[PDB]
Ligand binder design. Structure first.
Ligand SMILES: Nc1ncnc2c1ncn2[C@@H]1O[C@H](COP(=O)(O)OC(=O)CCCC[C@@H]2SC[C@@H]3NC(=O)N[C@@H]32)[C@@H](O)[C@H]1O
Ligand SMILES: Nc1ncnc2c1ncn2[C@@H]1O[C@H](COP(=O)(O)OC(=O)CCCC[C@@H]2SC[C@@H]3NC(=O)N[C@@H]32)[C@@H](O)[C@H]1O
Lengths: 235, 235
């Protein structure tokens, strides 16, 4: 009854009034590629590790099952598909979303969305949490807060699914294309602090051909940060 | 992201762009009570007894998983729950539908919806097909044809699920209530013919406490028609 016209993402949609976590349900259940798991609220939503992701009613909490047939070397770029998809949807609603490498979307440096990709073999789960009309924690913002008025959640869902399907289809044929879109929508040219096994500061210059964040330290040393157990902090 | 407020029916919804039959999928898949299976189009939609149910885009094709902890005796009234639900939704949209025993909903004697209940063991599958914006078979009708305008399909879905949840919750406590609702919304006092072996004709007087159609033959003989492979023609 939703009348989705996408090719892969959105072929099927499983909606829940409440769920523990759409990413967990998607990882655990036997699902077809393109199936979207979405819930009004999550009781055990999580980000990066197992850090809690606030998922109250009013936001868009979903996960997408993917089985990309592209080269193994390209797989790490799925998180960017989610971030760019969110940015494109935000621009459709006239909200200035910008990507904070590697998985966050900010509006005036406040976190409006987070992307979490989890994989086990050939099955990849793309999770996206976007604050729409819900209350948010400190350090965050929402579409409603930025626009000053409520936004139809279903409209945001339709927009995002349409964008993700297009991005995913093109990723299958041109896996390098997404990097261009990321660079064009990412926060760069500013000082950042990279937190991981230790920490260092420098200018976030760009992302390379593998999506690694290129940082120029003050002494001129160039470091390449790869996606993993590393966080980014703006100064 | 649908924000459904129902108690049981609609706690979970599985949407398909395309499916063979929502009833078949509901019967062969483990699903919690209240799960709704809905699709934009069915390629193998079917009716009460070996007949195809045209399910093109624009219509509302869905199935609901139920597991009524009620006496065996009542199980056969589930079809009425669907029929009455459709009648209530149509009324909300300014359409006067009437029930043609035992599972049809007509508008000015033109079929606008059909109900199909299948008990395959543990669960009971309540299937409902309602013509909204889709093209229909000759002699049939749709909400769009009745209103002369495009009706938002999702609004019809929301309305119907809301009505069905209420009817079902009440049914679990007061199983006989549905009968009078059917009587007040069913086509009675007219002549009908029961086809097949032992065929006969008479006036459809009412439905009894078991949902059987009570027919008065011209001879004065009274016959009770049960659910099943029954074919009924208005004379
Ligand atoms: N609603 C919210 N908006 C902005 N920040 C939040 C937030 N809820 C919690 N936070 C904070 O932001 C941090 C998020 O950590 P990360 O940057 O590593 O992590 C992320 O940004 C990934 C979040 C993915 C969420 C979606 S919801 C659908 C799917 N199902 C799930 O269970 N997860 C995914 C936490 O440390 C929190 O303190
Ligand atoms: N779309 C339509 N609108 C009105 N009449 C139709 C129609 N499609 C077919 N018909 C005719 O109406 C009669 C219907 O037969 P019955 O009275 O036995 O049967 C019914 O009316 C029950 C139909 C149930 C349909 C739903 S769709 C969701 C779920 N998934 C399924 O596969 N089925 C259920 C047939 O003899 C057809 O000629």
């Amino acid at each position: 009854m939703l009348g989705l016209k996408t090719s892969i993402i959105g072929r099927r949609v499983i909606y829940f009034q409440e769920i523990t976590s759409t990413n967990e349900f998607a990882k655990t259940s036997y699902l077809e590629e393109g199936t979207v798991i979405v819930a009004d609220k999550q009781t055990m939503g999580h980000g990066r590790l197992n850090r809690k992701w606030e998922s109250p009613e009013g936001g868009l909490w979903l996960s997408i099952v993917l089985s990309p047939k592209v080269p193994q070397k390209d797989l790490p770029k799925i998180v960017f598909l989610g971030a760019v998809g969110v940015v494109e949807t935000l621009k459709e609603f006239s909200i200035d979303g910008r990507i904070k490498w590697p998985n966050d979307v900010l509006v005036n440096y406040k976190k409006i969305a987070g992307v979490l990709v989890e994989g086990k073999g050939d099955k990849i789960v793309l999770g996206i949490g976007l604050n729409v009309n819900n209350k948010v924690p400190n350090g965050a913002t929402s579409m409603k807060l930025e626009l000053g008025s409520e936004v139809p959640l279903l409209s945001v869902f339709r927009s995002l699914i349409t964008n993700l399907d297009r991005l995913y289809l093109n990723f299958l044929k041109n896996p390098m294309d997404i990097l261009n879109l990321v660079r064009d929508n990412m926060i760069l040219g500013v000082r950042v602090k990279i937190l991981g096994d230790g920490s260092f500061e420098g200018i976030a210059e760009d992302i390379d051909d593998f999506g690694r964040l290129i940082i120029r330290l003050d002494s001129g040393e160039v470091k390449k940060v790869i996606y993993g157990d590393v966080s980014l902090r703006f100064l």
